[PDB]
Amino acid sequence: LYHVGYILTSVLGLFAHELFYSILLFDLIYREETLFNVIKSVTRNGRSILLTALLALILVYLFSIVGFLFLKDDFILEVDRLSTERACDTLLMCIVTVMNHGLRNGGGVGDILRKPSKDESLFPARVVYDLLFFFIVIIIVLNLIFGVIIDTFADLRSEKQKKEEILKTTCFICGLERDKFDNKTVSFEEHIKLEHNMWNYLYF
Amino acid sequence: STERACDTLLMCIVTVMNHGLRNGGGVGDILRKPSKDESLFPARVVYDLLFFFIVIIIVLNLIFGVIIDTFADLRSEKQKKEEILKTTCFICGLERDKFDNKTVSFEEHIKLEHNMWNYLYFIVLVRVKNKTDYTGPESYVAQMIKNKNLDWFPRMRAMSLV
Amino acid sequence: LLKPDPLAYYENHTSQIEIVRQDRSMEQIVFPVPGICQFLTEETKHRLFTTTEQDEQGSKVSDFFDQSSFLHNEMEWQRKLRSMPLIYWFSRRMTLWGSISFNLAVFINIIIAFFYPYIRPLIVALILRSIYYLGIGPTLNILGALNLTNKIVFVVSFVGNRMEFLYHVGYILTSVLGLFAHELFYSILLFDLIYREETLFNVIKSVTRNGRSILLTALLALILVYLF
Amino acid sequence: STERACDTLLMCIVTVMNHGLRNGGGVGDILRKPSKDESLFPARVVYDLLFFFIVIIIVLNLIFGVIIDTFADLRSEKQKKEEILKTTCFICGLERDKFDNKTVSFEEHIKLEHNMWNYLYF
Ligand SMILES: Nc1ncnc2c1ncn2[C@@H]1O[C@H](COP(=O)(O)OP(=O)(O)OP(=O)(O)O)[C@@H](O)[C@H]1O
Ligand SMILES: Nc1ncnc2c1ncn2[C@@H]1O[C@H](COP(=O)(O)OP(=O)(O)OP(=O)(O)O)[C@@H](O)[C@H]1O
Ligand SMILES: Nc1ncnc2c1ncn2[C@@H]1O[C@H](COP(=O)(O)OP(=O)(O)OP(=O)(O)O)[C@@H](O)[C@H]1O
Ligand SMILES: [Ca+2]
Ligand SMILES: [Zn+2]
Ligand SMILES: [Zn+2]
Ligand SMILES: [Zn+2]
Numbered sequence: 039l040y041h042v043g044y045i046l047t048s049v050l051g052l053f054a055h056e057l058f059y060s061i062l063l064f065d066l067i068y069r070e071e072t073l074f075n076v077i078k079s080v081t082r083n084g085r086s087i088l089l090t091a092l093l094a095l096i097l098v099y100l101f102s103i104v105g106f107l108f109l110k111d112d113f114i115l116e117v118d119r120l121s122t123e124r125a126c127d128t129l130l131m132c133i134v135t136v137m138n139h140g141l142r143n144g145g146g147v148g149d150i151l152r153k154p155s156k157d158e159s160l161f162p163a164r165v166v167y168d169l170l171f172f173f174i175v176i177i178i179v180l181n182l183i184f185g186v187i188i189d190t191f192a193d194l195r196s197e198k199q200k201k202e203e204i205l206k207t208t209c210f211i212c213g214l215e216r217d218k219f220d221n222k223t224v225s226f227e228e229h230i231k232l233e234h235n236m237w238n239y240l241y242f
Numbered sequence: 243s244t245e246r247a248c249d250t251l252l253m254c255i256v257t258v259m260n261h262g263l264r265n266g267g268g269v270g271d272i273l274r275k276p277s278k279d280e281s282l283f284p285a286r287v288v289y290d291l292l293f294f295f296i297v298i299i300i301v302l303n304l305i306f307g308v309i310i311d312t313f314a315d316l317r318s319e320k321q322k323k324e325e326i327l328k329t330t331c332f333i334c335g336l337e338r339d340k341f342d343n344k345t346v347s348f349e350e351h352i353k354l355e356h357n358m359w360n361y362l363y364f365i366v367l368v369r370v371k372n373k374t375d376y377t378g379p380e381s382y383v384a385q386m387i388k389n390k391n392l393d394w395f396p397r398m399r400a401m402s403l404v
Numbered sequence: 405l406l407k408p409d410p411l412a413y414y415e416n417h418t419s420q421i422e423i424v425r426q427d428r429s430m431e432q433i434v435f436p437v438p439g440i441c442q443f444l445t446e447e448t449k450h451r452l453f454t455t456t457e458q459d460e461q462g463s464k465v466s467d468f469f470d471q472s473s474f475l476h477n478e479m480e481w482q483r484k485l486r487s488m489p490l491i492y493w494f495s496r497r498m499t500l501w502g503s504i505s506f507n508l509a510v511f512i513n514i515i516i517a518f519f520y521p522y523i524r525p526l527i528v529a530l531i532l533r534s535i536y537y538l539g540i541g542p543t544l545n546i547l548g549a550l551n552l553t554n555k556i557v558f559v560v561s562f563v564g565n566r567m568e569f570l571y572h573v574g575y576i577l578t579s580v581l582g583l584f585a586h587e588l589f590y591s592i593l594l595f596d597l598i599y600r601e602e603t604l605f606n607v608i609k610s611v612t613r614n615g616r617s618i619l620l621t622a623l624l625a626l627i628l629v630y631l632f
Numbered sequence: 633s634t635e636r637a638c639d640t641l642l643m644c645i646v647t648v649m650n651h652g653l654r655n656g657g658g659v660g661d662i663l664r665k666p667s668k669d670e671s672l673f674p675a676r677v678v679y680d681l682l683f684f685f686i687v688i689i690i691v692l693n694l695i696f697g698v699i700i701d702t703f704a705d706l707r708s709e710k711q712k713k714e715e716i717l718k719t720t721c722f723i724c725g726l727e728r729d730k731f732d733n734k735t736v737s738f739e740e741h742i743k744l745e746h747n748m749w750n751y752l753y754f
Contacts (some may be wrong), residue, residue: 072617072620073620080300080304117275117277138291141291142268187307227460255630258632263629263684264656264658301625301628305618309618309697310697312610313700316613317704326462327453355421355422358453361421367435379423392465392466396422396424396430399430400422401422521641
């Protein structure tokens with residue numbers, strides 16, 4: 039199916055528009071096993087990553103609710119038209135702003151809100167809001183999305199080590215360890231080649 | 243005052259590779275800041291979020307997950323090597339466990355009987371002595387050394403265990 | 405009675421091994437250790453003990469036996485060398501040359517960084533006095549000359565103490581380039597902290613062991629950037 | 633209104649160590665933004681990308697991978713030590729599995745016979 043899709047993309051590029059040969063570069067993931075292993079680390083626990091993203095979206099939704107109810111006058115966004123607009127006139131806009139401009143920042147949504155003045159009555163509220171966003175949705179959740187990948191890497195490495203040592207140590211048919219064939223007339227390197235040759239069983 | 247990047251696909255690639263990867267939020271940080279009353283605003287939001295979530299959280303974090311995994315692999319393999327070196331015998335590959343309650347402890351099995359440097363000395367002796375004066379074992383080991391055989395070494399069996 | 409002094413001398417030159425006879429029975433061969441067995445350097449022993457790699461089975465002997473001949477050649481070379489007094493004196497002091505060369509490189513780089521718009525404390529004071537009296541340029545020239553001579557001595561010791569040699573000759577090339585071509589070429593000499601340190605080399609190994617993985621991930625990032 | 637850093641090599645080092653390491657995109661975020669028609673534009677692109685990819689994705693990530701690896705090493709060592717403490721006897725170093733189906737179990741072989749405090753008392 040992948041190869042016929044490749045043919046389809048090639049013919050589209052040849053006839054429809056030359057800007058379809060780009061997708062062909064996604065043969066590097068197929069021609070290579072190392073890159074495929076990295077993408078496997080990404081996409082083995084894919085449900086974990088997607089559910090963590092949904093958790094981040096839920097937290098963004100709650101923070102957007104709080105901002106819309108209380109801090110809706112601090113959601114002011116610079117714009118370049120063809121001077122400064124207001125984001126929070128509707129909870130959907132608050133969610134969009136806090137998900138686009140709040141996740142894509144090193145300090146959370148507090149980097150886009152109106153910069154407060156120390157002599158305001160909402161200053162402690164803004165400080166707590168920004169710090170909570172930064173500590174819950176940018177140091178933990180967006181870091182869980184990466185800790186999951188790291189843990190998946192470790193799991194793949196351990197699984198591959200187990201499989202390889204099983205293959206190179208124990209017999210394929212009888213599952214008999216290598217050490218059992220020490221100080222014996224037949225060595226394990228011979229037991230697997232003449233007696234328990236798994237291809238002789240297929241021939242039989 | 244200000245220039246346009248995308249007048250050619252090469253310039254778009256250069257801008258999105260230089261100013262896109264080198265940012266905490268992706269190419270959405272250099273692109274003209276849109277206005278909510280535009281017809282492309284959802285497209286820009288999706289574009290920026292996709293760039294951020296694919297090329298700056300999953301593809302610029304695999305270059306680091308790989309490093310962490312390599313660290314773990316190095317530690318594991320070094321630990322295996324150190325355990326093998328400090329527990330099993332170099333020549334016969336016999337664990338330290340088998341030399342408990344025996345007359346000779348493992349601390350002597352490696353220092354007196356199965357001293358690999360003694361085997362090196364024996365090899366040098368066998369290849370420095372004239373062939374006629376070889377005693378039985380010396381001529382035997384010379385014969386095997388000529389045959390490229392390695393059986394004369396002990397293998398999973400010391401002699402102090404029997 | 406045979407316990408230990410002639411007896412101590414004989415017990416110091418009498419090695420026993422446990423070769424396995426053809427009939428699956430073990431013997432205990434006791435033999436005098438040849439003379440050249442007193443020249444095997446301790447560093448070589450440590451290297452062969454640590455770096456030797458297990459083969460397909462749990463057997464490290466298949467490589468030790470292979471290295472036996474090279475060890476014998478080194479044994480003979482050490483016997484030959486110990487007669488030569490001057491080269492032997494150099495060879496005994498091999499870490500000293502490396503330390504001096506690295507310290508000179510670091511001091512040259514510090515002097516360049518701090519001045520270039522155009523017993524360690526005692527050595528620092530000496531360099532400061534040289535800077536005060538002669539000034540930068542001549543102080544730099546003499547420091548580079550000392551570095552080059554020390555690295556030549558280090559390389560002759562290295563060969564006499566026989567890819568790493570390629571690195572050392574590259575270091576020589578960089579030193580001479582800095583001394584003559586342009587004084588900003590000493591910057592590359594600071595890439596000896598990797599060679600002089602095992603920990604830094606271990607982290608760099610973590611980086612460059614799965615280098616193909618990192619490069620292919622970078623190419624994937626480039627493909628995604630191309631699509632965007 | 634704007635000062636120059638690179639009038640000397642020491643000032644360049646200070647600028648690229650203070651303003652380069654402390655940015656999410658390397659020193660390219662402080663350098664003058666170049667016009668596409670300049671002759672050195674490819675040079676600036678390569679310079680910035682190399683700084684970002686060598687000194688901010690690898691080295692400043694090695695400084696953290698080392699910490700992670702040390703965490704793993706500590707956890708493994710502590711698990712080993714705790715398991716040895718809770719399984720093998722302190723004095724004889726005899727596993728717990730050896731005292732199964734025996735007239736006396738490990739739970740008291742370490743409390744009556746091989747009590748190390750009894751050895752200290754002796
Ligand atoms: N039961 C087994 N356990 C482990 N390895 C096995 C087993 N059966 C076969 N093998 C391995 O699978 C491969 C099968 O080799 P095969 O019998 O086809 O011999 P061949 O084609 O002459 O090649 P070779 O030179 O590797 O022996 C060999 O690597 C053999 O060691
Ligand atoms: N088969 C072996 N298994 C384990 N360790 C070994 C083996 N052969 C040699 N060694 C170790 O390698 C080193 C070689 O010992 P060597 O004959 O050089 O002793 P030495 O120079 O007198 O020093 P020392 O006995 O104080 O370590 C020692 O550490 C010895 O324990
Ligand atoms: N050789 C050993 N192996 C394992 N655990 C040991 C060993 N020797 C002592 N211990 C443990 O150390 C502690 C020493 O117990 P101790 O003789 O002091 O009794 P205690 O202070 O009256 O306490 P308790 O009987 O309630 O455990 C106990 O936990 C004992 O299990
Ligand atoms: Ca004879
Ligand atoms: Zn079998
Ligand atoms: Zn042994
Ligand atoms: Zn006990």
